[PDB]
Every structure is written in C-alpha cells, then in structure tokens.
Amino acid sequence: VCSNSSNPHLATFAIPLGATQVPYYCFFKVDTYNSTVYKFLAVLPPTVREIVITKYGDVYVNGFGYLHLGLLDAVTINFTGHGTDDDVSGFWTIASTNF
C-alpha cells in the first residue's frame, strides 16, 4: 500500500505521510485472519527499473534484495480495466524466471 500525503487512516497509524506527495510512503498492512498493522517499508526511490519475486521469500527490486520472507505460494494483481491501465502499463515484458 502506497500513499502521498493522502492517508484516510495510515495517517492515524503512523504519521500523516512523512513526506509530501511526490515521495510515496508505502507500507505493508499485515493483513491476516487475526491482526492488522502497517509496517513502514520505504519511500518511492528516484528510479525503479525491474521487479522479481522468488519462491524463497525475498523480492529483488532493481537488484538489491531488500527483505526476505518465508517460502511463497502465489499472488494476485489488479489495477482496473480503466483504459490506460495496460496502455501505460510498466510491464514491457514479464518472464517466468528459473535459476
């Protein structure tokens, strides 16, 4: 979950944003069957270039391996069918990589 001085409740959770709109403070809501909390991750860096997610539990973004987790199962994604969601989509290409 990202945000840019626009926090209906993340402002209540921990600080309004921590920066202005151009920076994007983004958390994980620890959404599970019992508890829900927001863990601050980072702000939008000047450049983001590629993404890769591994089964082991670490996602490598731009080639740094920010954080590892347990073995992964799956994922789902949805922006909308609102026109340019695939026209200006960042995914030039996507590949099922293997080691």
Partner 1 sequence: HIPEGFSFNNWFLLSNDSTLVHGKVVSNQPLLVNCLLAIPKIYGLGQFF
Partner 2 sequence: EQPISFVTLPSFNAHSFVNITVSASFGGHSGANLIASDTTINGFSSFCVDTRQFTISLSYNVTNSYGYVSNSQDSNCPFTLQSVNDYLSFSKFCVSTSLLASACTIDLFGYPEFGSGVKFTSLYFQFTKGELITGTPKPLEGVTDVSFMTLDVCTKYTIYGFKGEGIITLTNSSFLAGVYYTSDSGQLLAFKNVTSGA
Ligand X SMILES: *[C@@H]1O[C@H](CO)[C@@H](O[C@@H]2O[C@H](CO)[C@@H](O[C@@H]3O[C@H](CO[C@H]4O[C@H](CO)[C@@H](O)[C@H](O)[C@@H]4O)[C@@H](O)[C@H](O[C@H]4O[C@H](CO)[C@@H](O)[C@H](O)[C@@H]4O)[C@@H]3O)[C@H](O)[C@H]2NC(C)=O)[C@H](O)[C@H]1NC(C)=O
Ligand Y SMILES: *[C@@H]1O[C@H](CO)[C@@H](O)[C@H](O)[C@H]1NC(C)=O
Q: Which residues bind partner 1 (CB under 8 A)?
A: 49-50, 52, 54, 58, 60, 62-63, 65, 74-82, 85-86, 89, 91-99
Q: Which of 1, 58, 61, 70 is nearest to 31 (CA)?
A: 1
Give dist(CA 29, CA 48) in Å, integer: 22
The least CB distance from residue 68 to ligand Y, in Å, is 26
Interface map 56-95 toward ligand Y (x if CB under 6 A): ----------------------xxx---------------
**With breaks defined as C to next N over 2.5 Å, after which residues does the chain break?**
none
Which one, 2 or 85, has the nearer CB to partner 2?
A: 2
DSSP annotation of 56: T
